[PDB]
Amino acid sequence: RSYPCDEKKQNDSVIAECSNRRLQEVPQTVGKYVTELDLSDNFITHITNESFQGLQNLTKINLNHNPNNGLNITDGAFLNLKNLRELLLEDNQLPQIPSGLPESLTELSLIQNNIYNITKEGISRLINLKNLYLAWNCYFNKVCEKTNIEDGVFETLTNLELLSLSFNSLSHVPPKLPSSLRKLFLSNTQIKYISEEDFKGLINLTLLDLSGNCPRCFNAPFPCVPCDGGASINIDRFAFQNLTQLRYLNLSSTSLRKINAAWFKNMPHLKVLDLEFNYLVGEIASGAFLTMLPRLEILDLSFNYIKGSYPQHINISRNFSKLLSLRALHLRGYVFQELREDDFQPLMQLPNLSTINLGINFIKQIDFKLFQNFSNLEIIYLSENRISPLVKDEFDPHSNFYHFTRPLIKPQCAAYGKALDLSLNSIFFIGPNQFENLPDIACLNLSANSNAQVLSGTEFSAIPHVKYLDLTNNRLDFDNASALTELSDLEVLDLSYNSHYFRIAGVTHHLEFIQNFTNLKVLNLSHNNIYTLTDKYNLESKSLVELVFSGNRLDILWNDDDNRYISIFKGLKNLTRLDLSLNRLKHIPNEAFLNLPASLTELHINDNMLKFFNWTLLQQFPRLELLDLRGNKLLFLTDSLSDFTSSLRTLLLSHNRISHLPSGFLSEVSSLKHLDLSSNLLKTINKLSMLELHGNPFECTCDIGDFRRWMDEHLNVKIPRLVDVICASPGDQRGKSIVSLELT
Amino acid sequence: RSYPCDEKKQNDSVIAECSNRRLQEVPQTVGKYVTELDLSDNFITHITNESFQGLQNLTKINLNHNPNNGLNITDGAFLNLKNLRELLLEDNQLPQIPSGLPESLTELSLIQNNIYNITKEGISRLINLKNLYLAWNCYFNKVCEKTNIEDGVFETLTNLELLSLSFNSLSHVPPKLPSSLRKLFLSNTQIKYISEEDFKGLINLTLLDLSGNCPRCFNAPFPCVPCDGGASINIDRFAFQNLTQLRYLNLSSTSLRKINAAWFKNMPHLKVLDLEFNYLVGEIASGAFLTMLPRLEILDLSFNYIKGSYPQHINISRNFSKLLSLRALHLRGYVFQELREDDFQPLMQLPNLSTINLGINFIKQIDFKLFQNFSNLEIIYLSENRISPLVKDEFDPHSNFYHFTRPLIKPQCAAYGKALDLSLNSIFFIGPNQFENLPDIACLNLSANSNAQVLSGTEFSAIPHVKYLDLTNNRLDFDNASALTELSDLEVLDLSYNSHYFRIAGVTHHLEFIQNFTNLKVLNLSHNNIYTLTDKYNLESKSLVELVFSGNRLDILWNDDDNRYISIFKGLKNLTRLDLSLNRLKHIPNEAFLNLPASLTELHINDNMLKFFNWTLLQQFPRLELLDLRGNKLLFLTDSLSDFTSSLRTLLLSHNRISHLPSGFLSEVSSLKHLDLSSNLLKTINKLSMLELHGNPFECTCDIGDFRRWMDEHLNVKIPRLVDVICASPGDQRGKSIVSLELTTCVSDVT
């Protein structure tokens, strides 16, 4: 049982996680076998040549964010560790590259420090370096007006594949870079001119990042100072003529008015070109460079809008048809009124185009017919446009800062088929022609359309094979038992955040339409504040697997004088996961709890106000693996759980007021694998494989020693976060983990 | 201050407020001199003939919401009170109208009870009744399928001016109503037919409410069961022929397809007609009845839309020009695409039309020229339409439930002149032609337009005389010192909830444009999360009276390493009211606090996390009347406040961790009128006119008795919620108010 580091097996080596544990120095109680040590987010201030004694087998050390004054690393502190490959020293307030680093180093990271001098003394001996990260060092500091890069400091590094000097005031591409380089990151370097010579010899390079050099300002979470007179980056005609291996060019936020087609003459393999936050409305219209990119897969031209120009049409060159390899186009924030069928003629041939991103263009009209003309289109993303009803009579320094990195559409949605995201549009009601002349849509997002309409069950007729449907953040009036019945194939329905009309007494609430879905698996009714239904008072489905019922008023339903809702969930005969969280429940009528489906594997009733829980009733739930009761006001446990369940694997009781464990509890219940008793009022204790106890106010006075014995006996039971299992009393202990006491 | 009722003198009579004080029975410690007694929101269950013994001067009793099983009122319990005019008995669970009520009664209220029988025995003796309220009695109850109204039960009441039977299952207008009736309220009564006879003799009537009878459902906070086959209310041809005095007709939510113009034949004075939540798209187009309303001032036709119909145009009859007296038209929720100049020709003549309400119509285009064709138009309300950028050219049972009762536009805005509310529209940027062909606008609402634009100071050129401007709930990029400079004459600016771009480092933040406003009085920057400005680091104005700076990051600004923001507010030389609430302040640098304007009358720093407050620095603030420090983490008071201020009138210190009052604090500071020490950690105490102490964990052990003396001596000092000034200790006291102890016999230990 390791302290204070949770030591774990990974492939063919032993990892130590000692992150975020208030450690004031490198623990010397680290396993002899360990090869990778994480000490990030701690309060360590000193690293001596004695800090890693008896640990010669370390290949990786992480010391990032230490402390939370500065980190003091002595000369040749690591030099003894002859097998050290990966050394991470980020956000340590380091004033110089620590001297005497081990020549075995392949990956060094010094991001977010006060390193102004990049010296031969520091790194020229590190001739095994593959990856060097030096970003965020001389970045808008008043002490340092330019990073000092000793001449030829990198040329000895003939194994260096990745160099990163992003977010440093360089002003000039450093000379004498090693030919070995595959990826050169120079984003936000204040480099305004790129010469013929700058990237000479770099004939192996696959990625170049010149982003944020002469920036166009928009939404960056770091400072944005445009080049004087809004001037673009000046890139010589031939600067990239020897870069024949380049796959990834990032020119985001360089204020480019014109793109020289010469730049791409000897670059036949370019796969991903990033042109976000430039002034290229012209070049998108009459693009020379579009002919030079036959192998391009990802193009991004987002936020190239002309300030104040709301053109009627988007002007797209016919040359866009010479992007034969294109898989994904990103045309966000161009800002235009209408997309005509003809405007997108150039794109209809491209055999591999799967993703069109027209987000944040404030488009009013789209000839939706034009989306049938596309071979392998999987993702139509139109979020933040102005599609009306149709009737017609603090940040991650490692992130990609200029590109949408996460999926445009939830993978769980896209999985089903062609995905259409019309979220944050103006479809205030679904018009009769709303989805006419549309491919077979599988995945549809109508989230946040200020839609507050009634559903007759004839809105989705033109796209009847929708499987995943998001109607979240609307004010839909569920006034009709026919609502959504036209969608027979439907498997996932998200009605989250439609509370408006569910709160209103002067309108009926019909949820019977659920019953008509033979294929429906997952229904989300979170945050609808449901307090009544009319006519049919039970939810019923033979198919449904998961119901989210959180943020509703079961408190009101299960306290109906005529017990109308006592079996609201029973008719869900195939339900395995039910979420009753945030329903303001104080007491659950035994009858009502006994009418929860017998099929339940996983029941969440967390974040209510339960004082009592009739453990007896678990007898009626023989498939129940997981019970979540966290964040209630529970006081009492059964003292005979074994009599009530043979099924229960995981029991979560975090954030209750439990002060005493029954004598026969921890022992017995052979099914129980995971028990969570963290953040309770346990003063002392007095098969399983995880036991959480952190945040309990333990009396550390001899009586505890009995439990401390049991921890040493049962080592198979993982007690996580031992650092946070603290003594409340007595006064001299108030602070120590309960693994610090003696026996006297 | 009598216990437990706060007695107050008002216009030669004494009111007793004993509401919301957990009283389990009528207190017998009420002054004989009292004329009005409020006992609402208590736990009283019994009213006997001994409940108000003496107390002969009582004219008004309020017993509403008592308790929170039922209220038990004995026969002739009030009969002794020979001067009882107003008796309020609302939400008491009463099973019958209490027998033997006093004949002196003029106003009786019995709303929200279980009164199924309206008997002659109960009310026929009450021949002085002006106002009887019986709403919400037999309302969707399973015991009672109809209210039983004894025949002729009201006809003895020849003084009855107001009768209310709203929200009761009647099914038929009761017969034999007194001719004295001025206002008859029959809303949600389930009355489907109205006969010639029903309102015969009611020749004095000024108001009739038939709303909610055959309802159209939309947003009502009470049940809505439409008449079978969506049938409208059936009102006979001549039902209103004797109602020549009627001013107010309410036909809201009666599902009316057709409005018989006969109804208004002998009704020449009708002032206010309410037709919300009907099916009158036709009648608005044709409209016989429009010729019959020469004196109408308020018409409301809101929510008459045809479900699913998004017509290109609104069809209003030419007859709308025969509404000569109209002051306000309410056409919400008709739902149409375009308003053309000619669509509103019939309204342009009407000499007195001041308010057009086109809310929630989802209009895409408006010929804004057409609003110059109006004589006395003061309010153009277009909230919740779809006006795009232009580039080319627990409820209140007493409420009015079917009408917008509050002002369409904040009075503070309208006051300045012609008001245009484009809130909750689609003006994502202000186009160059956005406010062209528009009257002289004084008051402009652009709130919640998903507007996320840069301002060049050329957007408002076409309406340069805007005085009140609301830009709230947008994502405006204040990246320009020229922003809004075209609006000279500007007095009020609301920039509340525009935090988006103020949180973003990769954008400049210019607030210099304030300086260019010679007339600017009130500036609201609430909830903008301001943590930096570029170039100009101080706010400066010779004119500004009020700055709201709440929900910003003064924590970050006043902890700038180079002290850039130390005098951010000093250049506001005329400022009297400053709000620093919700700025996450733990400590205020003495320099920074000393650079707050000297002109400050009223400083709010509530809801921060302050541990310390240098009371000394108040010396530099000689005009300071009101200091709000509530909801901080303060521990200490000055012990010599008098040395630091002669100005301070109101000091709010609720929700701190203050555990001791200095001996010389309460005494001294003759200016102090209101002191708030509620919800602190005071164990004991040891000019003014209000002192709040409720929610302190008081030791009720002899030491307290000193204070209890001081309360009896200084009776002028109102201590509100004495009921909630509770003993924490010792164990035997934990629950009693500190006015329940005996000074003769207490304990000394348990400290």
Ligand SMILES: *[C@@H]1O[C@H](CO)[C@@H](O[C@@H]2O[C@H](CO)[C@@H](O[C@@H]3O[C@H](CO[C@H]4O[C@H](CO)[C@@H](O)[C@H](O[C@H]5O[C@H](CO)[C@@H](O)[C@H](O)[C@@H]5O)[C@@H]4O)[C@@H](O)[C@H](O[C@H]4O[C@H](CO)[C@@H](O)[C@H](O)[C@@H]4O[C@H]4O[C@H](CO)[C@@H](O)[C@H](O)[C@@H]4O)[C@@H]3O)[C@H](O)[C@H]2NC(C)=O)[C@H](O)[C@H]1NC(C)=O
């Ligand atoms: C079908 O249509 C008809 C209309 O054609 C509707 O009938 C109306 O119904 C409403 C709602 O019940 C009635 O309003 C009530 O009227 C009371 C009398 O008001 C008048 O006298 C006072 C002077 O004493 C004036 O001030 C009023 O004018 C305005 O004055 C100020 C603004 O300057 C406002 O405060 C007023 O609201 C008026 O706009 C009138 O000339 C009125 O007192 C009563 O007010 C209570 O509720 C309001 C808001 O909730 C509070 O401001 C107020 O405080 C009252 O409530 C408490 O406060 C007082 C004093 O502090 C206490 O004494 C109370 O006990 C209580 O604790 C209310 O607004 C309206 O009068 C009536 N129209 C006519 C002509 O009769 C039907 O309802 C409609 N049917 C349906 C189903 O909607």
Ligand SMILES: *[C@@H]1O[C@H](CO)[C@@H](O[C@@H]2O[C@H](CO)[C@@H](O[C@@H]3O[C@H](CO[C@H]4O[C@H](CO[C@H]5O[C@H](CO)[C@@H](O)[C@H](O)[C@@H]5O)[C@@H](O)[C@H](O[C@H]5O[C@H](CO)[C@@H](O)[C@H](O)[C@@H]5O)[C@@H]4O)[C@@H](O)[C@H](O[C@H]4O[C@H](CO)[C@@H](O)[C@H](O)[C@@H]4O)[C@@H]3O)[C@H](O)[C@H]2NC(C)=O)[C@H](O)[C@H]1NC(C)=O
């Ligand atoms: C952004 O910040 C701004 C400003 O910081 C903020 O806008 C202000 O919002 C506050 C409230 O949030 C407003 O203050 C209130 O104003 C109420 C209305 O005030 C007027 O009308 C009062 C009564 O009207 C009667 O008389 C007229 C004619 O005589 C008659 O026609 C009417 O029908 C009616 O019968 C009137 O009393 C008042 O005048 C007062 O002004 C001074 C104050 O210094 C005082 O000395 C006077 O003696 C007098 O009281 C004014 O003309 C007002 O009722 C309200 O007041 C009280 O009672 C409530 C509780 O019932 C309390 O909450 C309150 O403390 C008061 O005791 C209150 O004062 C203010 O007007 C806004 N300012 C502007 C410019 O609009 C925005 O809300 C912020 N925005 C966001 C998004 O947060």
Ligand SMILES: *[C@@H]1O[C@H](CO)[C@@H](O[C@@H]2O[C@H](CO)[C@@H](O[C@@H]3O[C@H](CO[C@H]4O[C@H](CO)[C@@H](O)[C@H](O)[C@@H]4O)[C@@H](O)[C@H](O[C@H]4O[C@H](CO)[C@@H](O)[C@H](O)[C@@H]4O[C@H]4O[C@H](CO)[C@@H](O)[C@H](O)[C@@H]4O)[C@@H]3O)[C@H](O)[C@H]2NC(C)=O)[C@H](O)[C@H]1NC(C)=O
């Ligand atoms: C200009 O445009 C260029 C592209 O033209 C762009 O370059 C790309 O930058 C991003 C951001 O730095 C790079 O993304 C990272 O890539 C590495 C390597 O990925 C490969 O290897 C891993 C397996 O090790 C595979 O999963 C992956 O499929 C690739 O084969 C990844 O390590 C990064 O993943 C982590 O970081 C993400 C961002 O924080 C996390 O979300 C993710 O969970 C990973 O973090 C976790 O694991 C990390 C492992 O080291 C660990 O360190 C973290 O703490 C955490 O536990 C990330 O995807 C991308 O590779 C570059 N593209 C190319 C082709 O090289 C520039 O960024 C852009 N310029 C600007 C200024 O934006």
Ligand SMILES: *[C@@H]1O[C@H](CO)[C@@H](O[C@@H]2O[C@H](CO)[C@@H](O[C@@H]3O[C@H](CO[C@H]4O[C@H](CO)[C@@H](O)[C@H](O)[C@@H]4O)[C@@H](O)[C@H](O[C@H]4O[C@H](CO)[C@@H](O)[C@H](O)[C@@H]4O)[C@@H]3O)[C@H](O)[C@H]2NC(C)=O)[C@H](O)[C@H]1NC(C)=O
């Ligand atoms: C309305 O309610 C629905 C139903 O709850 C919500 O949609 C679900 O959201 C949950 C998360 O809250 C989704 O579950 C997550 O899916 C991720 C991806 O799953 C795929 O990949 C995994 C392997 O990674 C496969 O097992 C799986 O078959 C899928 O192929 C997971 O990565 C998520 O976390 C997992 O890993 C972490 C460890 O980091 C663990 O903590 C988790 O326990 C878990 O193992 C997680 O499983 C779920 O897929 C969604 N369902 C559907 C049908 O879409 C909506 O979010 C909700 N709507 C609103 C508006 O609130």
Ligand SMILES: *[C@@H]1O[C@H](CO)[C@@H](O[C@@H]2O[C@H](CO)[C@@H](O[C@@H]3O[C@H](CO)[C@@H](O)[C@H](O[C@H]4O[C@H](CO)[C@@H](O)[C@H](O)[C@@H]4O)[C@@H]3O)[C@H](O)[C@H]2NC(C)=O)[C@H](O)[C@H]1NC(C)=O
């Ligand atoms: C510009 O347009 C905006 C957009 O409409 C407008 O904002 C509105 O202002 C008023 C106050 O000035 C808001 O009214 C309040 O809103 C709160 C929200 O929680 C309500 O709780 C309050 O009403 C309660 O009391 C009623 C009593 O019966 C209850 O029935 C009711 O349910 C509430 O509990 C209170 O009225 C209004 O909500 C906003 N609306 C929005 C969308 O922000 C602003 O006034 C306009 N600016 C100018 C200059 O006029």
Ligand SMILES: *[C@@H]1O[C@H](CO)[C@@H](O[C@@H]2O[C@H](CO)[C@@H](O[C@@H]3O[C@H](CO)[C@@H](O)[C@H](O)[C@@H]3O)[C@H](O)[C@H]2NC(C)=O)[C@H](O)[C@H]1NC(C)=O
């Ligand atoms: C349908 O449309 C909406 C809006 O486009 C999608 O909502 C967005 O979904 C993403 C991913 O779930 C949310 O990302 C989150 O951001 C917050 C940061 O505030 C972070 O806390 C979360 O961890 C997560 O990263 C995003 O906020 C959300 N946007 C809005 C406006 O709600 C929705 O996912 C779409 N549906 C489908 C099925 O694709």
Ligand SMILES: CCOCc1nc(I)c(-c2ccccc2)n1CC(C)(C)O
């Ligand atoms: C009572 C609930 O109403 C919901 C609803 N469903 C539909 I189809 C409509 C509707 C009505 C008129 C025009 C266009 C569409 N409406 C009404 C509005 C637009 C107000 O939501």
Ligand SMILES: CCOCc1nc(I)c(-c2ccccc2)n1CC(C)(C)O
């Ligand atoms: C970064 C600041 O950008 C704000 C801004 N102010 C204006 I005038 C515009 C704008 C841009 C193009 C077309 C129409 C209008 N925009 C940008 C958008 C519309 C994206 O918000």
Ligand SMILES: *[C@@H]1O[C@H](CO)[C@@H](O)[C@H](O)[C@H]1NC(C)=O
């Ligand atoms: C460039 O990479 C190739 C393999 O892709 C390698 O054989 C060659 O040695 C590298 N060139 C230099 C000069 O390091």
Ligand SMILES: *[C@@H]1O[C@H](CO)[C@@H](O)[C@H](O)[C@H]1NC(C)=O
């Ligand atoms: C399209 O991609 C597929 C694999 O997804 C590949 O086989 C095909 O050759 C690609 N075609 C072009 C023209 O890039």
Ligand SMILES: *[C@@H]1O[C@H](CO)[C@@H](O)[C@H](O)[C@H]1NC(C)=O
């Ligand atoms: C409910 O939907 C059905 C089927 O489309 C329709 O005929 C009916 O009019 C709807 N009912 C209501 C109350 O809107």
Ligand SMILES: *[C@@H]1O[C@H](CO)[C@@H](O)[C@H](O)[C@H]1NC(C)=O
């Ligand atoms: C649990 O409920 C059952 C009946 O459903 C009842 O017999 C028993 O009293 C309850 N158990 C506890 C511990 O309250």
Ligand SMILES: *[C@@H]1O[C@H](CO)[C@@H](O)[C@H](O)[C@H]1NC(C)=O
């Ligand atoms: C009101 O009544 C009492 C006796 O009923 C009388 O003595 C008293 O003088 C009256 N109130 C006032 C203010 O005079």
Ligand SMILES: *[C@@H]1O[C@H](CO)[C@@H](O)[C@H](O)[C@H]1NC(C)=O
């Ligand atoms: C109308 O009202 C007044 C009371 O204000 C009364 O004098 C008159 O007689 C009433 N008319 C009838 C017919 O009752």
Ligand SMILES: *[C@@H]1O[C@H](CO)[C@@H](O)[C@H](O)[C@H]1NC(C)=O
């Ligand atoms: C218009 O209002 C004025 C005063 O506001 C009034 O004298 C007149 O009666 C009204 N005019 C008409 C035609 O009703």
Ligand SMILES: *[C@@H]1O[C@H](CO)[C@@H](O)[C@H](O)[C@H]1NC(C)=O
């Ligand atoms: C108040 O501030 C002044 C300086 O402005 C300082 O000298 C004094 O010590 C402060 N008082 C306290 C109690 O901190």
